[PDB]
Design a protein around this ligand. Structure first.
Ligand SMILES: [Zn+2]
Ligand SMILES: [Zn+2]
Length: 91
């Protein structure tokens, strides 16, 4: 039920991460035996599936995405799309 649309969440906005902190994340080469990596078979950011050849990574809050796309997202929204937790992780 989306009757009241509070589109802008948070009173204070979350800052974007630095590339250095993202590049330091574990690089997971998506192999052909990996149709899904710790989640669905689809990378929400790309609305596309996981196949051999793409580069995945794991956010410290245990959430997998493609490194290429998450590196841009984290510097744009600085939040894990699935849990809305900040990156780098809050305290
Ligand atoms: Zn992706
Ligand atoms: Zn997360």
């Amino acid at each position: 039920m989306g009757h009241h649309h509070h589109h802008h969440s948070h009173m204070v906005a979350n800052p974007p991460a630095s590339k250095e902190s993202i590049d330091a994340l574990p690089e997971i080469l998506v192999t052909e035996d990996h149709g899904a990596v710790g989640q669905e078979m689809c990378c929400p950011i790309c609305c596309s599936e996981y196949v051999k050849g793409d580069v995945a990574t794991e956010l410290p809050c245990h959430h997998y995405f493609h490194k290429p796309c998450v590196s841009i997202w984290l510097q744009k929204s600085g939040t894990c799309p699935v849990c809305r937790c900040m990156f780098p992780p809050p305290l």
